[PDB]
Amino acid sequence: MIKQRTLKNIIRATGVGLHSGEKVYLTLKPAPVDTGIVFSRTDLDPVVEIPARAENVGTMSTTLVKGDVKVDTVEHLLSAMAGLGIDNAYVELSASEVPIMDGSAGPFVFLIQSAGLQEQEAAKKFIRIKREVSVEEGDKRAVFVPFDGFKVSFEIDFDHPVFRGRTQQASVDFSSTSFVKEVSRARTFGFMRDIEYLRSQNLALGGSVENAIVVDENRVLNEDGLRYEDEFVKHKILDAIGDLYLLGNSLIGEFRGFKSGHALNNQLLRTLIADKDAWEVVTFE
Numbered sequence: 001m002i003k004q005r006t007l008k009n010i011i012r013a014t015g016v017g018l019h020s021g022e023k024v025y026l027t028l029k030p031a032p033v034d035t036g037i038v039f040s041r042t043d044l045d046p047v048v049e050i051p052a053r054a055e056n057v058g059t060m061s062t063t064l065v066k067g068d069v070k071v072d073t074v075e076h077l078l079s080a081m082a083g084l085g086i087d088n089a090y091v092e093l094s095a096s097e098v099p100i101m102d103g104s105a106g107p108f109v110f111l112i113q114s115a116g117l118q119e120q121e122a123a124k125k126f127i128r129i130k131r132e133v134s135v136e137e138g139d140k141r142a143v144f145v146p147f148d149g150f151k152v153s154f155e156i157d158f159d160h161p162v163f164r165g166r167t168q169q170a171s172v173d174f175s176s177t178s179f180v181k182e183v184s185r186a187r188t189f190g191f192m193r194d195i196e197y198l199r200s201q202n203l204a205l206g207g208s209v210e211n212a213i214v215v216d217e218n219r220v221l222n223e224d225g226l227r228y229e230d231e232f233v234k235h236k237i238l239d240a241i242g243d244l245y246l247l248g249n250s251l252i253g254e255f256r257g258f259k260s261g262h263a264l265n266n267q268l269l270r271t272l273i274a275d276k277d278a279w280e281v282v283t284f285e
């Protein structure tokens, strides 16, 4: 059979929180079969756990909620876990947010490869899209399409000098195109206008050219840090791979995003969950 995977070893990472600007400790540990990805606030007492589930989501990133208790910026870590097929793992946080690291999945990918993958004696469960499912917000569109594989297609028209007047598009088929090589290290575009507001208000303190391609009203300041052609939509695809993993199992199917973000990504997932005939669970031999 195709088996569930966890981590072979505990691994620890230190970074800055995206919003605090303050040091935060992350520990990844193996978990049992059928656990999924479970976030732990160990700084609290009693420790509070929040499963990585669509229904546990509550702006510019994906936040998990249980009560007043939250875990911020889950999208990149969940994307690394999606990309390497990690089914089951505990995520312990010293604080309310995942460290932003280089601001891609690359750091998490590398810590998980370094931990090692452990097969478990239990069938890996897949969510296979049977029939099309879609959500719209003004011009924003997310859509699930039946497909023999996993495929994420992203298109956005952002009205900035940087894009030279052109819609940004990227497809990724994870039969030919590797998550690790072609999406995992992509950083988002930060717009001085947006960052300037937040920093004034003591928010997004941790965000810089270390964890973002920073663009002013005109130009990418830090072209030196570009890793890919069409990096922005490649990071959007990374964001969506992370958000889609809140389904709790790998997707067999195609995702199409048009101006979509975390908000619509979560609406799509719910809408699919609601639509029991749009999907079935499969395992393989």
Ligand SMILES: N[C@H](CO)C(=O)Nc1cccc(OC(F)(F)F)c1
Pocket: 018, 060, 061, 062, 075, 100, 103, 187, 188, 189, 190, 191, 194, 195, 204, 207, 208, 211, 212, 235, 236, 239
């Ligand atoms: N997932 C989201 C959206 O892609 C994300 O990657 N946000 C993000 C990443 C790094 C820095 C950052 O701060 C800022 F704003 F200053 F750039 C925001």
Ligand SMILES: [Zn+2]
Pocket: 075, 076, 188, 235, 239
């Ligand atoms: Zn992101």
